[PDB]
Design a protein around this ligand. Sequence first.
Ligand code: LXC
Ligand code: ZN
Length: 331
Amino acid sequence: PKDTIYHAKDAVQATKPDMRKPRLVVFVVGETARADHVSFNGYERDTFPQLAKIDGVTNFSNVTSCGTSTAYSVPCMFSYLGADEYDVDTAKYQENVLDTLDRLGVSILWRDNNSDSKGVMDKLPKAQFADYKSATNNAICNTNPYNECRDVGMLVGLDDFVAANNGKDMLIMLHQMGNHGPAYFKRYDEKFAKFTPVCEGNELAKCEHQSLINAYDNALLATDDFIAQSIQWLQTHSNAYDVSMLYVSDHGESLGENGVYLHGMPNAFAPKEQRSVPAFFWTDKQTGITPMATDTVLTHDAITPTLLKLFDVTADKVKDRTAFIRLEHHH
Ligand SMILES: O[C@H]1[C@H](O)[C@@H](O)OC[C@@H]1O
Ligand SMILES: [Zn+2]
């Protein structure tokens, strides 16, 4: 082990949940989703029909990931250093934004249907991380012939966590399997097999290109559903809690442009498809949180200041950063 390097020892929470409504936020950590396959960004297909029916969802049309892979992007998304000073090999020993929030009294929960938190949860109690790739944590793995555990299974029993943390601020990370490839066709249950025919081979270049896009877009429909159900879950708590949902994908995906597939390419020459990601923000009307303009130039660096602002936390290190939500409040 090594000593933790501090970045936000000045951090203070301006208000406490005994003096205003407690705050309950879900952060969906997405996977392999491309901004240009989002209906709201101009995609010809309605890949997000359920979110389109929910009042108060903001789509962000200009978000660039810090990197092109899970192990690289996820730690930077929760970092204080930002993409320009980020060092993947020492990120684990830096105070990160979850460390700050936990230290100031926010109850942190991380459920993972992807891999793990890539070091982000490592300093917090073991029980605050839960592996939802396991069929004995995730109750929703028998809805498909692959026996693949589904992201929506991470919503089961969250009410137990809320009850165990009654009246506290809470931040829940849900780490999605999402659009991970190459087997996009496995990523969604049959009710989302909307675009057809579907590539069901593992060698992507050998499928007809349209069938590859169809499988990828069907997987997006399942994520639309998962995010919508995450908002519906939050809404069952809106009387007692100020509830918000943030979604950001860890990176994009190549879909055969220039013959490139999957992701993980070094940033210097990775194509734009691997870095252009969707981001969504939803909040209940009574929270007073206001989203930034949909066309704000944004990156993964906006995540840490957003999470801090959602819990009324100020930290010098990110004082000049743009967030997904505004500093000005209408009364
Ligand atoms: O984005 C990063 C990539 O995912 C990683 O694996 O190598 C460096 C790149 O800059
Ligand atoms: Zn990923």
